[model samples]
Target: ALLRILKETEFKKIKVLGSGAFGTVYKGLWIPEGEKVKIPVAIKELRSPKANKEILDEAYVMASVDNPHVCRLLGICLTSTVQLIMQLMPFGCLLDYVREHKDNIGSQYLLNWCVQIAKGMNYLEDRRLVHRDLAARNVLVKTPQHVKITDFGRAKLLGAEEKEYHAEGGKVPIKWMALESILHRIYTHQSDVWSYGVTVWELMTFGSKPYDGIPASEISSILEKGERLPQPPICTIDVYMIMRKCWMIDADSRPKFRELIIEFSKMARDPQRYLVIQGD
Candidate 1:
């Protein structure tokens, strides 16, 4: 396991957090933590069987992405399997954390989380990059405000222009994926918005699995045919309405990330209404 190797490599300096579809994430002290003062490093093992080229492209894409919200590519490991070493997060992914500490997941905390994801997603959009995968499982938090988006294995360079982004070959994506992603059978900034809506669903449900029984084909059809998600966690009418705007039939109809960030930030500071119900 890469975590074992990282611990051995850093003399047990790093703490292995958890593993994902592609790799294991480690929270560890950086090289010369005392002098260089590197916070921590997230080492991801490329789980592709033998797609060395995919691994290499991911590294290149990671190297190219320069943003405060997105994690930086620290270094690389050419091992038995390709090890992707990057900024490590202490708290791990937000999804697992909220599930672990369920009581603290009231509307206030979740509203805060949603705002941050909107900001992060917007940041990717600003760089002309589409975070094909934006979910609770991907928003790994390091510190309160110092979180970074990891797992660039699916990130695509929408690159200095706006165009429809299709997969080289159709991808088996999360049910959380948007209509454009499935029907157009391609991805774009709007598709990211679709993933964003699902993210809100994730926070609202305290990280419940989506489309639990819905088949991919049906999910796509339902989404394309104007079937938006029903509000959950008993969310208030206004916030739930906001979610509708996000999951609209037309991807363009969805609000921009910056607009979402501003609106959500206002909600946190002074919400239009309380979105949670506590029964004891």
Candidate 2:
């Protein structure tokens, strides 16, 4: 299936939502061809005009996935620069959402989000697509209890027989990476699971950075010694147990996204049973 090339004139940028090293995201309005109504959209404008292949690859991955938990790619526009038109996520990135609503957000909502992310990852795993950059920052909050995984710029689709992807030089999210991914540049479904673990921690910690005070150069040694991120103070033992499972040194020991979905869904249904507060 081919992606629809949208007319540049139909997209009107409203304001800047945020900016990153790769691109700037804008709240925008998109008018479909021959339609009078305007639809809200998030426009991602790439920093480099020559990053055509990268943006197209990202668009292809987004277009290929159809899960509600995964972000939807509306279309693309090529004019002065490359722009991706995506569904507008009202609450913005999950990291910011957590940081802003930490006091008000309930444990049940957090657990439900865990299930939502796992469902999205499970769908990607089934399709042989490994989200190399799975993290809270890459997830967009559509509502207080709903999130959709975004930013497929670093995602990869594996071949039928390929078990792992050997990544070359690039900016790696060291804190969120699995040990194998950090040491050997090997990424698989398990590596993504490792990242998912960190993302869950991000939720539990209300958007705190992983390995808060640790330096990047020391992360490998720390992991080699079987050390992992400590449980957040507010996190329950049950939830922390899942994070520990994800951080297993042996990638094979990490739980699959499907298993995670089951676990989190159960907790979400009866959070009071699993989310008991611990007294320090």
Candidate 3:
């Protein structure tokens, strides 16, 4: 339906890149490169799977948002299938590199990765947008050095000075969520901070699967009671300590994003210790 609606418009023919519950995303080609025209863009085609009154609400939310570390919106087409076009992240998702090279990814490399993620988190927090889903799969690595936080399907705008918000998802990625995200189904900027801890773990583990031995149903109780993931060998003592802080039972106990970044920075300053994890 979107293709038919957009046939007379700028988008001529589009290539399918990915799809999700929001809709199928296509790589739209508007102008010819030889004509000195527009660049390639990613268009998210959102359709109500049930064909209800639901529309491009997420598209609208993303359109009004602007942040260097976040994806930028190009335009939207509200036809039968709601379409959202935005700037394309050149490189693939962050999990690709880490999963393919597991044993080799170390704490130093992970610390650098964490710093880039932190920069994105800092940017998001500055804009007062809570991603609600802060995992390795959502953070896009565009260029060799550029890392962005994407996947705002669950993101919500926070009122001035409002700290926490509720989302309607019965199941969260158990290993990647914070205590509140696990127990009360509440999330906040601080929850993102806690999720960052799991992200850091993913980076260090080289995209190792989370909750390997534990069941997802048990994750909430385990997290709510102050339990933490098993420390992988490549994790340094200092970084390990830092990861524990992000999984604290009391949400208030977690350090702020700035403080977390500071800890990462301190660990980064020491090469021999921070870079070299135990048994590495």
Best by TM-score: 2
The lDDT leader among the candidates is 2
How many backbone clashes does every candidate have?
4, 0, 0
Give the per-residue lDDT of model 1 (tens digit) for 1-280.
1121133254123566777576676665555323545446666665636565665655665676666667677656565767766776667788887778666556666777778778778878877787788888888776655556765467777655558677766355757677666666678888788788888887787777887777776786676567766778658777878878878877889888998888889888753364664741
Better of 1 and 2 by lDDT: 2
Relative to the unseen true structure, what is the C-alpha lDDT of residue 58 in candidate 1, on a scale of 0 to 100? 58
Of 1 and 2, the candidate ahead on TM-score is 2
lDDT of 2 by residue, 1-280 (tens): 3467798888899999988887999999999889898999999887725576766776776676788899888889887887888889999999999999877877788888999999999999998988999999999989887899987468888999999998988789999999999999999999999999999999888899888888998999999998988878767788899999999989999999999999999888887666654331
Candidate 1, residue 173: CA error in Å? 2.3
- The alpha-carbon deviation from the true structure for residue 118 of candidate 3, after best TM-score superposition, in angstroms, is 1.3
Report the poorest 10 consecutive residues by lDDT, candidate 1.
1-10
Candidate ordering by TM-score (highest first): 2, 3, 1
For model 2, state the Cα shift of residue 124 in Å.
1.0
lDDT of 3 by residue, 12-120 (tens): 4368867766677777765532465876777777651533234445445566666666777766666565666667777767888678755565555567667778877
Over 4 Å off, model 3: 1-8, 12-14, 30-35, 48-61, 102-109, 169-171, 269-272, 277-280
| Model 2 residue 181 CA deviation in Å | 0.4
Model 1 regions lying over 4 Å from their true place: 1-16, 32-39, 48-68, 79-81, 144-146
TM-score of each: 0.81, 0.93, 0.82
